[PDB]
Write a protein that binds this DNA or RNA. Structure first.
Ligand SMILES: [Mg+2]
Ligand SMILES: [Mg+2]
Ligand SMILES: [Mg+2]
Ligand SMILES: [Mg+2]
Ligand SMILES: [Mg+2]
Ligand SMILES: [Mg+2]
Ligand SMILES: [Mg+2]
Ligand SMILES: [Mg+2]
Ligand SMILES: [Mg+2]
Ligand SMILES: [Mg+2]
Ligand SMILES: [Mg+2]
Ligand SMILES: [Mg+2]
Ligand SMILES: [Mg+2]
Ligand SMILES: [Mg+2]
Ligand SMILES: [Mg+2]
Ligand SMILES: [Mg+2]
Ligand SMILES: [Mg+2]
Ligand SMILES: [Mg+2]
Ligand SMILES: [Mg+2]
Ligand SMILES: [Mg+2]
Ligand SMILES: [Mg+2]
Ligand SMILES: [Mg+2]
Ligand SMILES: [Mg+2]
Ligand SMILES: [Mg+2]
Ligand SMILES: [Mg+2]
Ligand SMILES: [Mg+2]
Ligand SMILES: [Mg+2]
Ligand SMILES: [Mg+2]
Ligand SMILES: [Mg+2]
Ligand SMILES: [Mg+2]
Ligand SMILES: [Mg+2]
Ligand SMILES: [Mg+2]
Ligand SMILES: [Mg+2]
Ligand SMILES: [Mg+2]
Lengths: 147, 65, 117
RNA sequence: CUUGAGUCUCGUAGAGGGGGGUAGAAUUCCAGGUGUAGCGGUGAAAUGCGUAGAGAUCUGGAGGAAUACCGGUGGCGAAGGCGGCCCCCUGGACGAAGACUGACGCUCAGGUGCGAAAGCGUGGGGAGCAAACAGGAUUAGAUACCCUGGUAGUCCACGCCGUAAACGAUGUCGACUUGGAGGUUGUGCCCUUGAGGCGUGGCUUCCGGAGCUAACGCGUUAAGUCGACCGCCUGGGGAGUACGGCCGCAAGGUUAAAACUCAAAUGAAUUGACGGGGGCCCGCACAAGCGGUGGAGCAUGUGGUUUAAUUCGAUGCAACGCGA
């Protein structure tokens, strides 16, 4: 994008709930174009989220998001002759994306004898501020001030 | 700028210290003509008068005294 | 021994060193300490941080007299001399005024031939 | 005879020259005062300086040399050159209005004088600076180079020397030939004069027309159009050297060849190279992402080695599941 940065495909909303953020979440969790496999795990995890952690599964989604979605990160740019770890605040979409990435990676770092249970437990701990995704929001807020 | 020609003094004498200290920095140094717009002839006369005054200790050479 | 509460400082500031010494309206010096008088050597002894530490170790070395204000005689363009003057500013001294006392000859003597490369 | 060239009267500007005073910064030194272990230097240190008290700082003194700001390719001078201030002696230029002399002019071989810096002689003086030298950093070797010192010299007097890219690389004098912008210095007239507007000189800077020039460029301050006189040049190198003369205390200067050798040497301009320089803009080049390779097993190619032969070619990107 040297000449003009181009935007992103406005993805089509979730068929089960008409929301577009859960659509981006299932796209993030998807692997090798296996969308059916992905949305199966996503729906399974949100259903049990609506049970083990109170009602409002679609609301518990952002209950975990706003708990993990960062505000500041570092963008090492050499505007002074060397890569300087300058901190920057993000637009909403950047923190949305980083939140969902951090959720799915932590879910994959759990085992829990299923990916449904993995994502469910991880998203619950994230919603009530427990686990590792919240910790990697803590570190991204910590090193954002270290320089 | 073209001051002494508007006034028409025949010679800027060294005694008129009152009219000198405005051609002098607070440090005591002479200010160039390109800043005060004085004509070069009267600039020379000013320089001579100022040096004579500095000698008579009417003006200071510098502030270091 | 005695009190002044408004002294005068002198930062003789070469490109190779920076010495700072204070007295009180009289030239009778009180406390001196050099950037080189603090283990530093080479280019290290010519840094504004060395100026910081020299300012500190003079202020404390004279604090027995407990001065509270300061004139500063900055002389010679040592590298980063605002450094030490504001170090002293923070050291508990309301600096009264600064004075560039860098001696300027009126073509008095022939200077040495400068570096050739 | 008065238009050239001069003289007189009134003024103006100026680092023009010579002499003598004097001032204030700063450097170094000395004297003490305050006040201790660093100062100074560098790539980093060392030599050096500092406990006999530095360095830093204050006061006093001594001494030498040079004159910040003004300051301007601004001014003056034949050129070299000339820079605080004051006085004394003195040269030149320019302007206004007259008066006076009446061609008294221009140029100039030889000649005479002046002539940056270095240098030489004699005697001074000597702060700073600094050839040479000394020492420290230091290799078959110390010279490089840098530091810390440092004499001559730099300064004064009086003698020599007489050379510089002493350059505007442009001899002096006169006349003539379109313009524009300045700087500086006069001076006349004038708007109500100050300011300001019209003039009219001298000097000086930069554009540019005709013209000129090989071109670059010069261009009323000519390298234009002419006149008078002088100096000088005749391929490059040998060589501004040898010999001789003259000059000088000396260093050397000046005048000035030939043998020999080359087929060029040179001037200006043109087009490219000259990337371990700039600037701009591109590309999955990076950034943001996703999946890999590098680890494991196997497939295949190459290198290597082995072999009787392991056919031959392809070898950075742009050879290596390539010819096949
Ligand atoms: Mg004179
Ligand atoms: Mg003095
Ligand atoms: Mg002392
Ligand atoms: Mg002249
Ligand atoms: Mg007659
Ligand atoms: Mg002659
Ligand atoms: Mg002579
Ligand atoms: Mg000489
Ligand atoms: Mg001599
Ligand atoms: Mg002698
Ligand atoms: Mg020396
Ligand atoms: Mg030396
Ligand atoms: Mg040596
Ligand atoms: Mg050398
Ligand atoms: Mg002489
Ligand atoms: Mg000659
Ligand atoms: Mg010259
Ligand atoms: Mg010549
Ligand atoms: Mg002529
Ligand atoms: Mg004129
Ligand atoms: Mg022209
Ligand atoms: Mg002209
Ligand atoms: Mg001519
Ligand atoms: Mg010609
Ligand atoms: Mg010949
Ligand atoms: Mg000769
Ligand atoms: Mg001879
Ligand atoms: Mg002889
Ligand atoms: Mg690529
Ligand atoms: Mg990348
Ligand atoms: Mg492998
Ligand atoms: Mg093969
Ligand atoms: Mg292939
Ligand atoms: Mg094959």
């Amino acid at each position: 994008p040297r000449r003009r940065v181009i935007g992103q495909r406005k993805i089509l909303p979730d068929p089960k709930f008409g929301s577009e953020l859960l659509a981006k979440f299932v796209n993030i969790l998807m692997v090798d174009g296996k969308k059916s496999t992905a949305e199966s795990i996503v729906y399974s995890a949100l259903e049990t989220l609506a049970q083990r952690s109170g009602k409002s599964e679609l609301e518990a989604f952002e209950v975990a998001l706003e708990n993990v979605r960062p505000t500041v990160e570092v963008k090492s740019r050499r505007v002074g002759g060397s890569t300087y770890q300058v901190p920057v605040e993000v637009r909403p979409v950047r923190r949305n994306a980083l939140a969902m990435r951090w959720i799915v990676e932590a879910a994959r770092k759990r085992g829990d004898k299923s990916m449904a249970l993995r994502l469910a437990n991880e998203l619950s701990d994230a919603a009530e501020n427990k686990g590792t995704a919240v910790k990697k929001r803590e570190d991204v807020h910590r090193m954002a001030e270290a320089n | 700028f073209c001051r002494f020609t508007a006034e028409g003094v025949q010679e800027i004498d060294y005694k008129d210290i009152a009219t000198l200290k405005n051609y002098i920095t607070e440090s005591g140094k002479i200010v160039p003509s390109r800043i005060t717009g004085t004509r070069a002839k009267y600039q020379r006369q000013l320089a001579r008068a100022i040096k004579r005054a500095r000698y008579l200790s009417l003006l200071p050479y510098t502030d270091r005294h | 021994r005695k009190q002044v509460s408004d002294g005068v400082a002198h930062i003789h500031a070469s490109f190779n060193n920076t010495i700072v010494t204070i007295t009180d309206r009289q030239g009778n010096a009180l406390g001196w300490a050099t950037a080189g008088g603090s283990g530093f050597r080479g280019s290290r002894k010519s840094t504004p941080f060395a100026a910081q530490v020299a300012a500190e170790r003079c202020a404390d070395a004279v604090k027995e007299y407990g001065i509270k204000n300061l004139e500063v005689m900055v002389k010679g363009p040592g590298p980063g001399r605002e450094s030490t003057i504001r170090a002293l500013n923070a050291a508990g001294f309301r600096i009264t005024n600064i004075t560039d006392v860098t001696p300027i000859p009126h073509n008095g003597c022939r200077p040495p031939k400068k570096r050739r490369v």
